[PDB]
Amino acid sequence: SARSDVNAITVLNGSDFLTTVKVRGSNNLTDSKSRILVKQPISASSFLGTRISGLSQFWERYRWHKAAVRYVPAVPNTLACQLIGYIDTDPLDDPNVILDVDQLLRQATSQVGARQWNFSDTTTIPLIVRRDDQLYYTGQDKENVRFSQQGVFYLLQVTTLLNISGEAITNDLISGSLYLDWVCGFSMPQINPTPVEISQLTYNADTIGNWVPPTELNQTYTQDITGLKPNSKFIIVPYMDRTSSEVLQKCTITCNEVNAVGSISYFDTNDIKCNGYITFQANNIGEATFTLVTDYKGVTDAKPYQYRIIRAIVGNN
Amino acid sequence: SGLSQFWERYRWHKAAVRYVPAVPNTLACQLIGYIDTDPLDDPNVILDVDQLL
Amino acid sequence: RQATSQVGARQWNFSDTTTIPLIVRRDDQLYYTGQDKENVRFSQQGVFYLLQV
Amino acid sequence: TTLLNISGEAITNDLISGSLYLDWVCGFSMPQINPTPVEISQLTYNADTIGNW
């Protein structure tokens, strides 16, 4: 009858679509960390609209019975590069810290499911299953990752691509895509809230900090903001409820990473000014780092400028 | 499709759709193909590209 | 579609080779030589249509 | 030999061309544990530049 009140394994199958790759050329390839181009976990609730991420906000646990990551080229055979991929089952064993490029690749053809292939053909990177009965939780990665993520797909580039005339290409280039056929088994019916649905965004605004003041007159120091989520896309706007006498000028600039939209300023003489907006995504540890440019003469500041953060609750974000 | 007008009803016991190329391997584009069985819910209404694929 | 219905049709790239055969009616009919004068079903035993996709 | 392209001219810039594996067999003898080389260079101050403003 109905109202079962029972827990049962439900095995499912399908195929999906990960993100397209983006091979690096020459003007974006000078370090070990450029050889690594996609760091992408292989959990369930880690995508948008794939039939495995949307289908996992309705159970609570999972276990990849057998998975495989399938590469498909989008290039002619007349182009030349070479890339390898491996799935590490210890998501906090990070290759972020290796410096010499050769060591970075030798620790990839050691994991027990690694492959190697040109970017003009196809091959399946399989996932390898621990010898236990462990069940991993769905949802966003909250405190520790060894509960949630069952693997991490690291694809990384060996060579540098090049045209038919041998001239190494300078810009980026799309070299195919990744699809992930899967078979997994879920256990506990419920709903995780972290991938909320559209028509429920709220635009929270209740976090009001304050910029630290300088000590000297001219300075371009920096500042960091903690307590934010490990990953999101925020926006800042200024906020000012103070007074002044002479100038009290200041000009904060965007954080020192990729995302940047504009600038922001503060200026409190008769030609007063308070405007700007910066967009960014917080680093994986859950903070950010700004840089300031202060050029006022008063030293007894005693009035730290206030700011604001706001975000849209629409999904994992 | 002329000889089906002599019977009201049908059902495909089997089908399949080959791709017979025309180019060499010096031209490249991933193209993806499928057969949807709800012939009313269509892809034309989507307005982005990452969800269409 | 009315070309891959006739019982001797082929398809091929223009960089390889293949033989298009002629198919023979099940009768003893003998066709006349010469120019096509009044009606063509006496003289011509076939018509080779090649066409580009 | 120098590099050559599709058309028989020399390439101007360097590049990477492949990779090298090592399919081995080996035999070890005496069980033990060798050290790990810990090394550190002392401090060294460098005041040998007169400035000007």
Binding site: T109, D121 | V20, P21, N25, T26 | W12, S15 | -
Partner: peptide, 23 residues
């Protein structure tokens, strides 16, 4: 003698990549 098997093997399989299939 005193030999663990299959420590870190690798297997390679070649293929080809013609210029046209011409089905």
């Amino acid at each position: 003698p005193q030999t663990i098997p299959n420590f870190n093997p690798i297997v390679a399989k070649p293929t080809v990549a013609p210029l046209q299939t011409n089905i």
